[PDB]
Amino acid sequence: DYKFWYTQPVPKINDEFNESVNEPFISDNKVEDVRKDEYKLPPGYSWYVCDVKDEKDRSEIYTLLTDNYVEDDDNIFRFNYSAEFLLWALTSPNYLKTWHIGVKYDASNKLIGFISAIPTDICIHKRTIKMAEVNFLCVHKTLRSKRLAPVLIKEITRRINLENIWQAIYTAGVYLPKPVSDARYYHRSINVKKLIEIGFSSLNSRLTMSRAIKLYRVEDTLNIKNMRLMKKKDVEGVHKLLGSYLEQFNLYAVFTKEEIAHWFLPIENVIYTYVNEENGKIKDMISFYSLPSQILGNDKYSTLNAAYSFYNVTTTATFKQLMQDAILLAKRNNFDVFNALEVMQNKSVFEDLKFGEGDGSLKYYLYNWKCASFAPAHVGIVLL
Numbered sequence: 001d002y003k004f005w006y007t008q009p010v011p012k013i014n015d016e017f018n019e020s021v022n023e024p025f026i027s028d029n030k031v032e033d034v035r036k037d038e039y040k041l042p043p044g045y046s047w048y049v050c051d052v053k054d055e056k057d058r059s060e061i062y063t064l065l066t067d068n069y070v071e072d073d074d075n076i077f078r079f080n081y082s083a084e085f086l087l088w089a090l091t092s093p094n095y096l097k098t099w100h101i102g103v104k105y106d107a108s109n110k111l112i113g114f115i116s117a118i119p120t121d122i123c124i125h126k127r128t129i130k131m132a133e134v135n136f137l138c139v140h141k142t143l144r145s146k147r148l149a150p151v152l153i154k155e156i157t158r159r160i161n162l163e164n165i166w167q168a169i170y171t172a173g174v175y176l177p178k179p180v181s182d183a184r185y186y187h188r189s190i191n192v193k194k195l196i197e198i199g200f201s202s203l204n205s206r207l208t209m210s211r212a213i214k215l216y217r218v219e220d221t222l223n224i225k226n227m228r229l230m231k232k233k234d235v236e237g238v239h240k241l242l243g244s245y246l247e248q249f250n251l252y253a254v255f256t257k258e259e260i261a262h263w264f265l266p267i268e269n270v271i272y273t274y275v276n277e278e279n280g281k282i283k284d285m286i287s288f289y290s291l292p293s294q295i296l297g298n299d300k301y302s303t304l305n306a307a308y309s310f311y312n313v314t315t316t317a318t319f320k321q322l323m324q325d326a327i328l329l330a331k332r333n334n335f336d337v338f339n340a341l342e343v344m345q346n347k348s349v350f351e352d353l354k355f356g357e358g359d360g361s362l363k364y365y366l367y368n369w370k371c372a373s374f375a376p377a378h379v380g381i382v383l384l
């Protein structure tokens, strides 16, 4: 029925647009007309402005997400974004603290809901638009199906519109009106044995434990011998290499140098970026972020460490050789599995590099934007 989504400027379930349509649902919006009152919460709940730079406010958001955020379909894994990852994800250039919105239960003073946005320039079918990237919408498990989520959504929309921004980008595993693209995820086992023991991977009479371990063995030698952790001197080179690469896609963020520095400079247990420099020029890059999942009800293991393919560009090797090196660098950093979406050129290497198809897919959405949908190979952005 989508009783809430149908009141919003997003496509109806049956809407399909020609490649030539690329425009808002509602144009000529006026900042002066935006509501100045906060949306009403049910009795006993209050808005709270989170300070993600304050360790203790950041720890509250962390706890709320650790306990109540996204699980896989079978409720075996729940994402466990670290506190330091949340700092990086929310404090990108020109971020607004007022777009990091909590909801507390007054009587306990406990955070029970959150939603966030950061500003980014998004190019959709060759038109670049200032947008908000929305993420970390979460309502405590005890308060589900009370229609709190549309309150969170309408309040962040209002605060975004105060900044004269009228479009947003977001991703979800659930189907909503109406994806612009849908990308399945794939997984490449690194610590085979652990993945078998927690239920993620399987054996059979052909594939015994020892044979599974040998199937996924990797050689500890890079195809691109000089691939090294990115350093601040590499920001201009990464900006040129990535910025050029991304223009081929139907949907991508347009990064400034500031943004390159924030989204790529390495941070242990958060973001890993490697580069290959030749004559002071960056010719190849690999990047993946750390997103562990908490393992629910396994006696032996509590955490699955997982590296998430982010942006990868090669000019001196084949894309397969580059992604093989990305797997190796993940293995060198203690990750159990390497996860990738079928975006950009990724799908082309999955069979050869022994990726297995996962359980589900990630839907990409835009708010207040009408356009043709497209295959995920034409998606050139990866959200957190």
Ligand SMILES: CCCCCCCCCCCCCC(=O)CSCCNC(=O)CCNC(=O)[C@H](O)C(C)(C)COP(=O)(O)OP(=O)(O)OC[C@H]1O[C@@H](n2cnc3c(N)ncnc32)[C@H](O)[C@@H]1OP(=O)(O)O
Pocket (backbone or CB within 6 Å): 001, 002, 003, 004, 005, 006, 068, 069, 070, 071, 132, 134, 135, 136, 137, 138, 139, 140, 143, 144, 145, 146, 147, 148, 149, 150, 153, 156, 157, 160, 161, 165, 166, 167, 168, 169, 170, 171, 172, 173, 174, 176, 367, 368
């Ligand atoms: C111009 C600026 C524009 C800015 C805003 C752009 C839009 C931003 C939109 C947000 C983007 C976030 C992206 C992002 O964070 C990444 S996707 C991860 C979302 N978070 C989780 O899955 C965490 C675990 N689940 C929860 O915490 C709750 O189930 C949530 C809070 C999801 C819903 O709480 P609830 O207690 O289960 O449900 P009610 O309160 O009763 O609300 C039901 C209404 O919520 C609609 N719903 C459910 N899940 C949704 C989802 N993932 N996106 C959008 N809408 C979602 C649902 O269809 C229904 O509407 P309908 O009746 O029409 O069908």
Ligand SMILES: Cc1n[nH]c(C)c1Cc1nnc(-c2sc3ccccc3c2OC2CCNCC2)o1
Pocket (backbone or CB within 6 Å): 070, 071, 072, 077, 078, 079, 171, 173, 185, 186, 291, 293, 308, 309, 310, 339, 340, 341, 358, 362, 382, 383, 384
């Ligand atoms: C809960 C869980 N534990 N382990 C799994 C697999 C899942 C299910 C799942 N949901 N999204 C995904 C994937 S794979 C993936 C691979 C590369 C890049 C992004 C993603 C991605 O999305 C990102 C970005 C949007 N925000 C959530 C995380 O994977």
Ligand SMILES: [Cl-]
Pocket (backbone or CB within 6 Å): 154
């Ligand atoms: Cl309303």
Ligand SMILES: [Mg+2]
Pocket (backbone or CB within 6 Å): 139, 143, 144, 145, 146, 147, 148, 149
């Ligand atoms: Mg609710």
Ligand SMILES: [N+]
Pocket (backbone or CB within 6 Å): 134, 135, 136, 170, 171, 383, 384
């Ligand atoms: N996301």
